[PDB]
Design a protein around this ligand. Structure first.
Ligand SMILES: CCNC(=O)c1cccc(NC(=O)N2CCC[C@H](C(N)=O)C2)c1
Ligand SMILES: [Zn+2]
Length: 140
């Protein structure tokens, strides 16, 4: 679990969105595994606007933050799960790191701010849904 709290937005994995998120919906995209809802309180996270390929992510199944090198956002085949059929997910970045299904939502960050959230993983792989192209998260 986990979310990004930037301005009056809450960014979560679409597959973990709550009823309150759907009832306060701003934007969602199944192909990216992202959903954004509106918040009453202002958040403290800031979004990175850069092309970093190194950063640090939070892994809840280890209670640890790990440094990682990650691929550029791209269209990656993701195996079938209880949340989606096997399909191509867009704007996904892969890295070597520990992950389990419940680690989705953990933040990936670089020197410029939040880069994305954990969205997939494998045997020693972790994948992150990028948010750096979502420029509207910085305003309204
Ligand atoms: C080969 C064994 N797999 C793992 O150890 C493992 C390790 C970490 C995660 C996963 N599951 C995973 O990526 N998703 C489940 C939730 C929905 C995600 C999506 N965005 O479509 C995809 C499997
Ligand atoms: Zn950066």
């Amino acid at each position: 679990s986990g979310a990004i709290y930037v301005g009056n937005y809450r960014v979560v994995n679409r597959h973990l969105a709550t009823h309150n998120d759907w009832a306060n919906l701003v934007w969602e995209d199944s192909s990216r595994d992202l959903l954004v809802s509106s918040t009453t309180a202002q958040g403290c996270d800031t979004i990175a606007r850069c092309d970093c390929q190194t950063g640090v992510y939070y892994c809840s199944s280890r209670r640890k933050h790990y440094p990682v090198s990650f691929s550029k956002p791209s269209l990656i085949f993701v195996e079938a799960s209880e949340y989606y059929p096997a399909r191509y997910q867009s704007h996904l970045m892969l890295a070597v790191g520990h992950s389990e299904p419940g680690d989705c939502g953990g933040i990936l960050r670089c020197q410029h701010g939040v880069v994305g959230i954990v969205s997939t993983g494998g045997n020693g792989l972790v994948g992150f849904a990028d948010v750096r192209d979502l420029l509207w998260l910085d305003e309204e």
